[PDB]
Design a protein around this nucleic acid. Structure first.
Ligand SMILES: *[C@@H]1O[C@H](CO)[C@@H](O)[C@H](O)[C@H]1NC(C)=O
Ligand SMILES: [Zn+2]
Ligand SMILES: [Zn+2]
Ligand SMILES: [Zn+2]
Ligand SMILES: [Zn+2]
Lengths: 94, 109, 97, 79, 150, 60, 75, 60, 98, 80, 109, 94
DNA sequence: CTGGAGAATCCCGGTGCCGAGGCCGCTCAATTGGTCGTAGACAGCTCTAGCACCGCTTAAACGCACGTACGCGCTGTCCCCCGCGTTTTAACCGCCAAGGGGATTACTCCCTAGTCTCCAGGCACGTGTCAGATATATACATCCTGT
DNA sequence: ACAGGATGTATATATCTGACACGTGCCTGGAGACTAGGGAGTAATCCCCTTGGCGGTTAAAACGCGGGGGACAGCGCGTACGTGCGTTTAAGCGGTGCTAGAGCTGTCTACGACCAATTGAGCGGCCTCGGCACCGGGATTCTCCAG
C-alpha cells in the first residue's frame, strides 16, 4: 500500500497540451518518468556542485541557470533559459 | 479559513509540480538551503524538455500512422534530432530499436 | 528454380531487423548464461525477471553499437566482411582494452 | 556449466544484421561471445555488489540499472 | 540597408510614413536607427481614449528572425505591463513571426490596451481592478491618460 | 507587385521555393530549414506546427 | 458555416463555425488550427469588442463575415 | 513570361494553383479534377499515378 | 659527397626523441593568441591567468596526442603507414566525438 | 585577434604526430587537425567562461579550466 | 587537565589525518550523519593507494637513476601498472609525456 | 593570507616511510595532492550515493567498504579492503 | 651478404645554483568529556514472487551441398612526402609602467528554515470501449534470368 | 536495356481483445500564516597580478629542390561464406505446486550531533646546501654505401 512517486499525470497533461488527440503507452510513460528523473538528477547535481564551488550555501535561480547552460547544448539551452526566466518572473510578479 | 489556496504551479502557469520539485530538492540533500525560485526554474526546464520530446515523438508516430506513442517512436524522435541525441548520447531505451540506415557502399549498383 | 544472388537476402534481413525491436536472443539460454556468470561471485542468488530483461536489453544495445562500429572499421579497410581484427580495433579505440 | 554456447550463431548473425553488416566472417562468433561474456561479468559484478550490500538475496532491476548507469550506460524503462 | 534587418527597418519606416494606422506614430533615434520612438492615440470605445503614450524599442541584427524588446517611457497601469515598463507580449516573447512589422506591433499593443489578457497579470493590482472594480479601473486609466500628456 | 507577390513573404529577399504541407503554404527552403533547426516547428503564416516531413522543395 | 477572420499581416483565415458557437469556442478553434490560445485572442467585428461568454448570433455575425483577430497578448 | 510561368501547362489559360502530393507538379484545379473524374491517374510530366487524397488547394 | 639518410630513419629517431621528453610542443604565445581569439566570441574584454592558459595548452596537447595514436592505429589497420583525414574521421566517429 | 589558427603551425603538428607515434603524415592532415583543435577549444572555453561569468569575475582561472575539463570527463592533474 | 591527547591517526596506526577526513566528510554534505569508522576506513584506503603509487614512482625514478620523483616518473608508474592504469585511465598528468612504444610495423625490416 | 589545506605533509611522510632515500619535487607533490583529492571525492560520493539508494542517513564503514569495492579493480581492491578492515579493527580495539 | 665513414649517441668530469629540506612561532583545528534525541538493529508475521517441474507445439537451430563473390597476393606506376640547405620571421627573455580587478572586511536586512493547520490535488481502485494486432483477398513493386 | 515469371511487399476489410482513459473515494502533503536568525548583498579598501610596450638574440618556421618509396589501380587465383533444403531440439507456453524472503510493523539502545573548554602541530616564514642540468671532452654505436 506504500505510496509511489511518478510524473505520469504531468507528462500526460503535457501530452494532451501539445497533441490534443494522441495517447501514450504504459512503457512510454515509464521511459518518460525515467527521463525526467535523470534530467532532474543531472541539473540538481550540477547546481549543488556550483554552490559548493562558490562556497555558497543556497541553491538560487542563478545556479540552476548556469547548470542548465552547462548541460543543455545550444538552442535547447537558449530556449530552456528563456522559458525558465519567463516562469520565474511570472511567479515573482504573482 | 485563510484564503483560497492557489498552487504554485498555477501561480507560475506550469503543469509540473513546483511543490514536489521543491520537496525533492530539499530531501535529496543537494544544498543546506534552497532558494525560492529554484524549484520554479527547474520545473519550467523539465516541462520544456518533456514537451519538446513528446512533440517530436508524436510527430514521428503520426508520420507512422498511429495514435499511440511507444518506445520505438520515442527512439526515432530522439535519435533523429541532433541536439536531443547529443543530450542523450549515452542512454539506452528499452524496446527502442535503431534508426534504419545502410552505408552507401553496401547497396548494390 | 528461382535463386537469389548472394547478398540480397542479407539486405532484406537488415531492412527487417532495423525496423523491428523484438529481442534477438533466446530468453532461457540468456538467463542460464546470466546465472552461470553470477554463481561465481556469490552462490544461489535469485534474479527478478525484470532484472534479467534489463540485462538482455543492455547487452543487445551494447552489441549492436559494437557491430555498427566494427562495420565502419571494415568499410574503412576497403572490405565488406567484418573480422576479429575489426572487432578488436573498435574495442581498442573506444578505450575498452 | 558451458552455457555461453546458448548465444547461437544465427542469434549473433541477426544482431549483426540489426547492426548493419552485409556478410560476416567465420571467426566473428567466438570473438563476440567472448566480448559478451566480458561485458556480462563487468555488469554482474557491480549488480551483485549492490545487492550484497543491501543484505538481500534477490538481484533487483533497480540494482542492475544502478550498475549499468555506474558505467555511463544509463538504461531507461525499468525504474 | 547593410543587413536584412536594416532594410526591413527602412521599408517599415516607409510604410509607416506612407500609411500609418489610425492614431499611431513612430520616429527613430538620430544616433541609432535600431532604436525607435512612437506615440499612440488611445483607441476609441475604451477608457484609454485620448491617451498619449510614449514608447521605446530596441532591435538586433537578425530581426527578421527574432522579436524585439519594448518598454514604456510614460506612466502605465495595465495587467500586461510590469511596473517598470516591461511589456508582456506573446508575438514578442512566445509566438513571434517574421511577418509582423512595427505597425503591426503598435496596433497589437493598442488592442492590448483595449483588452487585458485575463491570464497575464503583469500588474496584479490592475488585473484585480479590471476583474472586479471596473469603475475604479477606468478611473485609474483616465488618471494615467491625464499624466500621459506630459 | 509581381516580385513581391511571388517572393518568400517572411524574408522578402529571395524566391518562393518551398511548400509547407500541413497548411499548404509556400515559403523559401532556407527560411523553412533555419526555423526548423531553431526549434520553431510552427508555421509563420498560419502559425501551426509541423515536422521534418511536412515541408519539401517546390519549384514554380 | 465558413467565416473569414483577418490577421495583421494581410492573411485571412477561414473558420467553419455556427451562429450559436460562443466566442470562446471560436477562439478554441483558432487555437486548434492557428495555435493561438483562447486567452490570447481579441476578436473584433464591426468595431465591437467581442466577449468570450457571448455567441456570434449575439453580435449579428452573418455568413462570410470578416473578423479582425488581433490578439490580447502575454509575453 | 511571368503569366506563362505561373499558369498551369495543361491549359496555359488558367493560373496554376494545385500541387500533386507524391510528384509535386503544379497545375490548375478543374483540369486536374476533371482528369481524375476521367479515371486517368496520369501526370503529364512524370506519368505518376495518384488518387483522391493526392491533391489539394494551394494558394501563393 | 653529401650524406642523406634513407627516408624514415630520422623520422623514427625524432619519434624516439619526442616520446622521451615532456616539453610543450606548441608555441606558447601563438597558442595564447588562439585561446584569446576563441574566447572573444563568448565574453568580450576577458582576462586570463597564465596558469589557466598553460592548463588549456597541456590538455589540448594531451588530447591531440591521444587522437593521433588512435589515428595511427586506424592507418595501420588499413594496411598502410600514412595517416589521412579519413583515418582521423574514423577515430573521432568511433570515439563518439562526431 | 583575427585568424590566429595559423599559429598552430605545420612542424608543431608534425611534432605532436611524432609524439603520437606516426611515421608518415599526409599533406591534408593539417586542415582537419586545425579544425579538431578549434572544436575542442570552443567546447572547453565555453564551459570555462560560463563558470567564470557565473562567479561574477572577468578573469578566467586555472580552477575554472580544471572544472570544465573534469566535467568533460578528462580530469587534469597538477593544477589544484 | 583531562589526559594526553592521542590523535585518531596514531590510535589507528595510520599516517593520514583521520580528523581532517572526518571534517571533510561532514562539511561536504555527502550525508547528514557520518559514522565513526568511516573516516578511519577512508583514510586507510587513501594511505594505501598513495603508498602504492609512490612506491612504483620511486622504483621508476631509481631505474632512471634519479633521486627525485617528478611528473614523468609518476606518469610512467601509473601507466606501466595495469591496475593503476585502469583506475586512472581518464586523467592527464601535467608534464607527463607518453609511454615510449612504436608499432612493430613502423620499424624497418 | 588565507590558509589553504592540502595533504603534502602526509604524502611526504608516507614517501619517506616507503623509500627513506628519495625526494619529491613540488610539481610531483601537487600531482599527488590532486590525485588524493580526486580519489577522496570519488569514494565519498559513491558512499553517499549508496546511502541515499538504501534509504539510509548515515555513512558508515560498510558504505565505504562497498564504495571502494565498486571503484578499485581486482587485487588493488582486495588489498585496499584488507588494509581498511585491519585499520578499523585496530582503531576500535584501541 | 661484409667492412670503413660519418653522424648520432653514450659516458665521465667540473661547476653553479635554485629549489628541496630542516627549523621556529603560534593559532586555529583537533581533541576530550558530557549530554540527549533517534536512526538503526532486531524480533516477528505475512503473502508475493521466484524456483522447480511436466506435457505438447513448433519455430528455430543444426547439418550439408554448392558456386560464386570477395579477400588476398603480385605488379606497375607516378606523384606525393621526406630530407636538407638557405633565407626570413617572430617567438622568447628581460625589463619597465599603469591600473583594473581579485580578495578581504562590516553591516544590515531581507530571505528562508521551522511549526501548526487544513483542505484539495493526486493516488489506489473499478470499469467500458476503441486502438491495435491478426487473418485474408487483393494490387503492385522488385529480383533474376533469357533475350 | 527490355520483358515476364516468381516472390516479396503494400492496401483495404473484417474481427477480437485488453490496455487505456475516465470516474470515484479518500487521504496526506502542499499552501497559508507566522516568527526568528543568519547568508549574503553592498560598500569601502588594499595591492597583485594582468596587460601593454620596448629592444635584442637567435631558434624555429618557410621555401625550395631532388628523389624514392609507398598509395593506388589493376589483374588473377581460390576458398569460404551466403543460400536453400531436410532433419533435429529445445525454446516457449500453459498449468501446477512450494516456500524463501521482501517487505512491513513494533521496540528499544547505542550512537552521532551538539556544546564547552583545552592544547599542540601544521602552516607560514626563513635560511641552507647538494641534485641536477649544463658545458666539454673522450669513447661507442647505427646506418649508409662501396665491395
Ligand atoms: C529567450 O530568452 C532570451 C534571453 O534574453 C531572449 O533573448 C530570447 O528572445 C527569448 N526567446 C523567446 C522568448 O522565445
Ligand atoms: Zn524566405
Ligand atoms: Zn501556415
Ligand atoms: Zn490547370
Ligand atoms: Zn508528376
Amino acid at each position: 500500500r506504500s505510496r509511489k512517486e511518478s510524473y505520469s499525470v504531468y507528462v500526460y497533461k503535457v501530452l494532451k497540451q501539445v497533441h490534443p488527440d494522441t495517447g501514450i503507452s504504459s512503457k512510454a510513460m515509464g521511459i518518460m518518468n525515467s527521463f525526467v528523473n535523470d534530467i532532474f538528477e543531472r541539473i540538481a547535481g550540477e547546481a549543488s556542485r556550483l554552490a559548493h564551488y562558490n562556497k555558497r550555501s543556497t541553491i538560487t535561480s542563478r545556479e540552476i541557470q548556469t547548470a542548465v547552460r552547462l548541460l543543455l547544448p545550444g538552442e535547447l539551452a537558449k530556449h530552456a533559459v528563456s522559458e525558465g526566466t519567463k516562469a520565474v518572473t511570472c511567479y515573482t510578479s504573482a | 479559513a485563510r484564503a483560497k489556496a492557489k498552487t504554485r504551479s498555477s501561480r507560475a502557469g506550469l503543469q509540473f509540480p513546483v511543490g514536489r520539485v521543491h520537496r525533492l530538492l530539499r530531501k535529496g540533500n543537494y544544498s543546506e538551503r534552497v532558494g525560492a525560485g529554484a524549484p520554479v526554474y527547474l520545473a519550467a526546464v523539465l516541462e520544456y524538455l518533456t514537451a519538446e520530446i513528446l512533440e517530436l515523438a508524436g510527430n514521428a508516430a503520426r508520420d507512422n500512422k498511429k495514435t499511440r506513442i511507444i518506445p520505438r517512436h520515442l527512439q526515432l524522435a530522439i535519435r533523429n534530432d541532433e541536439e536531443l541525441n547529443k543530450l542523450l548520447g549515452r542512454v539506452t531505451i528499452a524496446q527502442g530499436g535503431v534508426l534504419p540506415n545502410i552505408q552507401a557502399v553496401l547497396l548494390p549498383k | 528454380p528461382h535463386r537469389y544472388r548472394p547478398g540480397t537476402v542479407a539486405l532484406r534481413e537488415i531492412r527487417r531487423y532495423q525496423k523491428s525491436t523484438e529481442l534477438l536472443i533466446r530468453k532461457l539460454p540468456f538467463q542460464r548464461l546470466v546465472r552461470e556468470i553470477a554463481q561465481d561471485f556469490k552462490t544461489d542468488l535469485r534474479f527478478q525477471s525484470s532484472a534479467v530483461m534489463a540485462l538482455q536489453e543492455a547487452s543487445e544495445a551494447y552489441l549492436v553499437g559494437l557491430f555498427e562500429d566494427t562495420n565502419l572499421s571494415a568499410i574503412h579497410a576497403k572490405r565488406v566482411t567484418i573480422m576479429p581484427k575489426d572487432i578488436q580495433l573498435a574495442r581498442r579505440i573506444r578505450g575498452e582494452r | 556449466r558451458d552455457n555461453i554456447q546458448g548465444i547461437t550463431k544465427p542469434a549473433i548473425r541477426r544482431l549483426a544484421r540489426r547492426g548493419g553488416v552485409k556478410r560476416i566472417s567465420g571467426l566473428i562468433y567466438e570473438e563476440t561471445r567472448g566480448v559478451l561474456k566480458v561485458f556480462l561479468e563487468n555488469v554482474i559484478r557491480d549488480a551483485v555488489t549492490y545487492t550484497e550490500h543491501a543484505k538481500r538475496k534477490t538481484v533487483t532491476a533497480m540494482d542492475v540499472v544502478y550498475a549499468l548507469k555506474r558505467q555511463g550506460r544509463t538504461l531507461y524503462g525499468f525504474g | 540597408m547593410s543587413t536584412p534587418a536594416r532594410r526591413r527597418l527602412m521599408r517599415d519606416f516607409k510604410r509607416l510614413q506612407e500609411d500609418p494606422p489610425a492614431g499611431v506614430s513612430g520616429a527613430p533615434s538620430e544616433n541609432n536607427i535600431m532604436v525607435w520612438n512612437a506615440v499612440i492615440f488611445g483607441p476609441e470605445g475604451t477608457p484609454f481614449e485620448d491617451g498619449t503614450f510614449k514608447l521605446t524599442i530596441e532591435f538586433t541584427e537578425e530581426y527578421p528572425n527574432k522579436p524585439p524588446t519594448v518598454r514604456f517611457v510614460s506612466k502605465m497601469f495595465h495587467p500586461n505591463v510590469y511596473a517598470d515598463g516591461s511589456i508582456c507580449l506573446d508575438i514578442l516573447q512566445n509566438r513571434w513571426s517574421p511577418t509582423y512589422d512595427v505597425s503591426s506591433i503598435l496596433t497589437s499593443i493598442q488592442s492590448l490596451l483595449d483588452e487585458p489578457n485575463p491570464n497575464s497579470p503583469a500588474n496584479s493590482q490592475a488585473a484585480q481592478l479590471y476583474q472586479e472594480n471596473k469603475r475604479e479601473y477606468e478611473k485609474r486609466v483616465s488618471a494615467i491618460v491625464e499624466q500621459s500628456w506630459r | 507587385d509581381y516580385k513581391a507577390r511571388l517572393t518568400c513573404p517572411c524574408c522578402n529577399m529571395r524566391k518562393k521555393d518551398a511548400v509547407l504541407t500541413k497548411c499548404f503554404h509556400v515559403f523559401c527552403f532556407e527560411c523553412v530549414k533555419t526555423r526548423y533547426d531553431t526549434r520553431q516547428r510552427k508555421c509563420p503564416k498560419c502559425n501551426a506546427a509541423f515536422g521534418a516531413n511536412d515541408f519539401h522543395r517546390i519549384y514554380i | 458555416m465558413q467565416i473569414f477572420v483577418k490577421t495583421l499581416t494581410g492573411k485571412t483565415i477561414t473558420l467553419e463555425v455556427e451562429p450559436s458557437d460562443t466566442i470562446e469556442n471560436v477562439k478554441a478553434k483558432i487555437q486548434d488550427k492557428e495555435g493561438i490560445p483562447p486567452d490570447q485572442q481579441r476578436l473584433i467585428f464591426a468595431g465591437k469588442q467581442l466577449e468570450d461568454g457571448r455567441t456570434l448570433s449575439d453580435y449579428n455575425i452573418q455568413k462570410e463575415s470578416t473578423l479582425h483577430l488581433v490578439l490580447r497578448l502575454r509575453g
